[PDB]
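Exercise 7. Predict the joint structure of the components listed below.
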Amino acid sequence: AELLSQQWEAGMSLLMALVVLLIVAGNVLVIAAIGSTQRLQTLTNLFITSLACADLVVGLLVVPFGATLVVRGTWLWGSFLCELWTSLDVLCVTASIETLCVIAIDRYLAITSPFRYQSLMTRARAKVIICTVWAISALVSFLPIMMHWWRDEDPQALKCYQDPGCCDFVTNRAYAIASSIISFYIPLLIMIFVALRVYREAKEQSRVMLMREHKALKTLGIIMGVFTLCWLPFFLVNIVNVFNRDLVPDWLFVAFNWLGYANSAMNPIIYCRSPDFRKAFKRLLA
Ligand SMILES: CC(C)CCC[C@@H](C)[C@H]1CC[C@H]2[C@@H]3CC=C4C[C@@H](OC(=O)CCC(=O)O)CC[C@]4(C)[C@H]3CC[C@]12C
Ligand SMILES: CC(C)CCC[C@@H](C)[C@H]1CC[C@H]2[C@@H]3CC=C4C[C@@H](OC(=O)CCC(=O)O)CC[C@]4(C)[C@H]3CC[C@]12C
Ligand SMILES: COc1ccc(C[C@@H](C)NC[C@H](O)c2ccc(O)c3[nH]c(=O)ccc23)cc1
Ligand SMILES: CCCCCCCCCC(=O)N(CCO)C[C@@H](O)[C@@H](O)[C@@H](O)[C@@H](O)CO
Ligand SMILES: CCCCCCCCCC(=O)N(CCO)C[C@@H](O)[C@@H](O)[C@@H](O)[C@@H](O)CO
Ligand SMILES: CCCCCCCCCC(=O)N(CCO)C[C@@H](O)[C@@H](O)[C@@H](O)[C@@H](O)CO
Ligand code: NA
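Solution:
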């Protein structure tokens, strides 16, 4: 009884710390590699930096707080931090998918109008783009949460809101559908639509330079496909819940949300497809 709990707590604390380490180390590396390698200070990599920041915030704040909930079996940190934690969670996934959209648009523009791209895309504008994404994402995530537009009137929902060790994020049906559409589905569609036009246009194309570019494009494609595989199961289940809470087992709904957090560890590994990133990682780790 108390032994079975001790074994589980200690083994889970350790797995959690591993995830935290991998997310934080991997994304600090990406940021430091870009922040100290001129060859890597392209405009596209400014968006990559932004994406690393969303992942870094998941590593430093989102996962650590989720970890304490899974390991200790209650929320230890009070009402405010529960709301803040929830806000940052929604914020990071919103920021990530909107950033992946920008990246897909960046590539579409550079490939179909390399001359308009040259005169339009500057560092100052890349900066404005990045901040606009974070602004919108802040908008979509903080306010509805701080204005309590997510709450429900249910017996189960009020059972959680007064209990100070509950932080389940039980929402009303309107918020579930609205946030899912606004924070995830709409940008997911834009990104797919644009990513395929990039596919077509890259395929409707010296040989060595073209092979090198198509390698980098494929890396971005993999970044986008893995993000989709990590979050689509959760958002598919979030919706299906609205209509029938019996269709999908709870343990699996929880699992899919963690698969979402997990995505934050995957991009630095995926960037090892690049010799330039690989060499900068080797140079930084000393
Ligand atoms: C606790 C939560 C709310 C986290 C808040 C994070 C944001 C404030 C971060 C995430 C991504 C960051 C951005 C990532 C990339 C850039 C590009 C960067 O462009 C540069 O001039 C530096 C690169 C160079 O040109 O050498 C300027 C900072 C900026 C806008 C950062 C500003 C701060 C941002 C928006
Ligand atoms: C709230 C959800 C449902 C909307 C998700 C849409 C976003 C993922 C993307 C789609 C196209 C993106 C926009 C495409 C182009 C621009 C112009 C861009 O660059 C500038 O405006 C700089 C120009 C300057 O100030 O000189 C600012 C960001 C913005 C609005 C982007 C912000 C994010 C947008 C709206
Ligand atoms: C299923 O078990 C868990 C595990 C962790 C958590 C923390 C909460 C804050 N997770 C939020 C989730 O990542 C999310 C992110 C972004 C969204 O737009 C979300 N919309 C929802 O309706 C419901 C959830 C939702 C909540 C429930
Ligand atoms: C949850 C995170 C939320 C991030 C919120 C982003 C805030 C909106 C963006 C913003 O504040 N700026 C646009 C940045 O693109 C201000 C900058 O323009 C500022 O640096 C200017 O004062 C100077 O450019 C002029 O000297
Ligand atoms: C970007 C996301 C923006 C979503 C904002 C949606 C807020 C809608 C308000 C809302 O739906 N409720 C009030 C919360 O302020 C809760 C009700 O759905 C529910 O509690 C009861 O009315 C039940 O009886 C079901 O009808
Ligand atoms: C309230 C009870 C909910 C408990 C849910 C906790 C699940 C543990 C989360 C976790 O750290 N992983 C499983 C994810 O759920 C491991 C991840 O690193 C995983 O994604 C990778 O191992 C694979 O992607 C590649 O091998
Ligand atoms: Na509570």
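Discussion. DSSP finds eleven helices and no strands in the chain.
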